[PDB]
């Protein structure tokens, strides 16, 4: 580009994995004393979690490790910003990817394959995808770009849909509220969410989520599949951002003034052998889940679709409290 955020976004978009092009990116999943990079790594600080605020039972029920096993970080100069590397129990990411791909995209919610009205939804998305695999044209699941849950934009009023509120998925609600509680938002309520589905060449340009405090509540950002490069900038659009990786299962929480910062995803990184899954996903969802659990079993035919999809995709979930938002 021409200004410093656009320069870095283009840099990272055109960057070569596996070379020193990325030695400037923070990896919160690396074991260091905030070194090795220059300016980025030096900003990394521990952030304290409200460990007593999420019981063991409730973490487990959510598919999470016990909050006391979590690590969490901020960045000097970015108030309200918390980064938590994958706190999910092994296998449990598969549940949330399944829900995003198969259930949440189901028609009561709104997706990009129409604006807000309905197009003729011929041939259920999931069961086509199931039989695109069995038999050797662009999949209906491969075309999905975003999905709104809870609150849905109308695009003419430029505000949320009048008479179309859909109930917020209570498993994703429980998970979000456990994380938000441990970040010290024990009253948080999940009410509006967006699911973003990226291919390996998909990007997200420089943007802010909202422009107003006085109604701003915390926003949580989940990630699954391939890693992305995340750029976190400032209130004005040409302040140079800080680059960081989002690996499968990482969670970012934005509150306070962080909620207003310009951010971006310039790059979804391919698996280093071009097609394949991150290591944390090499664990399957247990066969026997706890009876009191908010997660449900996953079927082989469902897993196969997810496993094939994610080889070249990143799934993003953002969840926020409402009581809006370019």
Ligand X SMILES: O=C(O)c1cnn(-c2ncc(OCc3cccc(OC(F)(F)F)c3)cn2)c1
Residues that bind Mn ion (CB under 5 A): 209
At a CB cut-off of 8 Å and minimum separation 6, what does 158 contact?
none
The 3-state DSSP class for residue 262 equals coil
Q: x/- string (CB under 6 A) for ligand X, residues 31-70? A: ----------------------------------------
Residue with tokens 């092994």: 90
Q: Please provide residue 5's backbone torsions phi and psi, each rounded to the nearest 5 degrees.
A: -75, -40
| Residue 200 · residue 226 · CB < 8 Å | yes
Q: How far apart are the first and last CA of the chain?
A: 23
Restricted to residues 247-276, the positions that interact with ligand X (CB under 6 A) are 263, 265
Q: Which does 221 bind (CB under 5 to 8 A by kind): ligand X, Mn ion, none?
A: ligand X
Which CB, 274 or 326, lies closer to ligand X? 326
Out of 15, 93, 196, 312, the only residue in the binding site for ligand X (CB under 6 A) is: 196
316 annotated as belonging to a binding site for a ligand: yes
What's the rounded Cα separation, in Å, for the pair 221 and 317?
Answer: 6
Residue 263 assigned as binding residue: yes
Q: How many residues does the chain have?
A: 326
State whether residue 215 is helix, strand or coil: coil
Span near ligand X by CB under 6 A; candidates 23-31, 74-82, 275-283, 318-326: 318-326
Q: How far apart are CA 177 and CA 189, in angstroms?
A: 7
Q: Is 262 annotated as a binding residue?
A: no
Can you tell me the distance from the alpha carbon of 220 to that of 320, in angstroms, rounded to the nearest whole number?
Answer: 6
- Taking residues 115 to 144 in sequence order and writing x for each that binds ligand X by CB under 6 A, - otherwise, the string is ------------------------------
Question: Between the CA of residue 258 and those of 6, 205, 206, 292, what are the distances in Å?
Answer: 20, 18, 15, 36
- Cβ at position 300, least distance to ligand X in Å: 29
Q: 114 is written with which tokens? A: 């129409």
**3-state DSSP assignment of residue 244:** strand
Q: Given 3-state DSSP classes, what are the helix, strand and coil percentages for the chain, each rounded to the nearest 5? A: 30, 20, 50
Residue 213-252 contact track with ligand X, rule CB under 6 A, x = bound: --------x-------------------------------
Instruction: Output DSSP code: residue 169.
Output: P
At residue 265, the 3 state secondary structure works out as strand
Q: Candidates 194, 206, 294, 310: give the one binding ligand X (CB under 6 A).
A: 194
**Closer Cβ to ligand X, 121 or 127, answer by number:** 121
Nearest distance, CB of residue 8 and Mn ion, angstroms: 17
Stretch that binds ligand X, among 8-16, 145-153, 174-182, 269-277 (CB under 6 A): 145-153
CB 219 within 8 A of CB 253: yes
Q: Provide, rounded to whole angstroms, the least separation between the CB of residue 57 and ligand X.
A: 30
Q: Which stretch binds ligand X (CB under 6 A): 43-51, 146-154, 169-177, 296-304?
A: 146-154
Annotated binding site for 2-oxoglutarate: 196-198, 314-320
Q: Where along the sequence are the contacts to ligand X (CB under 6 A)?
A: 146, 148, 153, 194, 196, 204, 209, 221, 263, 265, 316, 318, 325-326
- Residues of the binding site for Fe cation: 207, 209, 263
């Amino acid at each position: 580009g021409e200004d410093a955020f656009r320069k870095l976004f283009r840099f990272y978009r055109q960057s070569r994995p596996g070379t020193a092009d990325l030695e400037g990116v923070i990896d919160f999943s690396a074991a260091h004393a905030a070194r090795g990079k220059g300016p980025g790594a030096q900003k990394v600080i521990k952030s304290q979690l409200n460990v007593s605020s999420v019981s063991e039972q409730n973490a487990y029920r959510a598919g999470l490790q016990p909050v006391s096993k979590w690590q969490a970080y901020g960045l000097k100069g970015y108030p309200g910003f918390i980064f938590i590397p994958n706190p999910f129990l092994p296998g449990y990411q598969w549940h949330w990817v399944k829900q995003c791909l198969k259930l949440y995209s189901q028609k009561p919610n709104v997706c990009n394959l129409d604006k807000h009205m309905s197009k003729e939804e011929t041939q259920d998305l999931w069961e086509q995808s199931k039989e695109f695999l069995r038999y050797k044209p662009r999949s209906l699941l491969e075309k999905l770009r975003w999905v709104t849950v809870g609150y849905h934009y109308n695009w003419d009023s430029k505000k949320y849909s009048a008479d179309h509120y859909t109930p917020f998925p209570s498993d994703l609600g429980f998970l979000s509220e456990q994380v938000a509680a441990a970040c010290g938002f024990e009253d948080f309520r999940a009410e509006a969410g967006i699911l973003n589905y990226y291919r390996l060449d998909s990007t997200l340009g420089i943007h802010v989520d909202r422009s107003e405090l006085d109604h701003s509540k915390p926003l949580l950002s989940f990630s699954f599949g391939q890693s992305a490069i995340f750029l976190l900038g400032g209130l004005q659009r040409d302040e140079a951002p800080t680059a960081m990786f989002m690996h499968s299962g990482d969670i970012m929480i934005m509150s306070g003034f962080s909620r207003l910062l310009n951010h971006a995803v310039p790059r979804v990184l391919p698996n280093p052998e071009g097609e394949g899954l991150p290591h944390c996903l090499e664990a399957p969802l247990p066969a026997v889940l706890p009876r009191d659990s908010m997660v449900e079993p996953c079927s082989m035919e469902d897993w196969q679709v997810c496993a094939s999809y994610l080889k070249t995709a990143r799934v993003n979930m953002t969840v926020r409290q409402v009581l809006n938002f370019p």
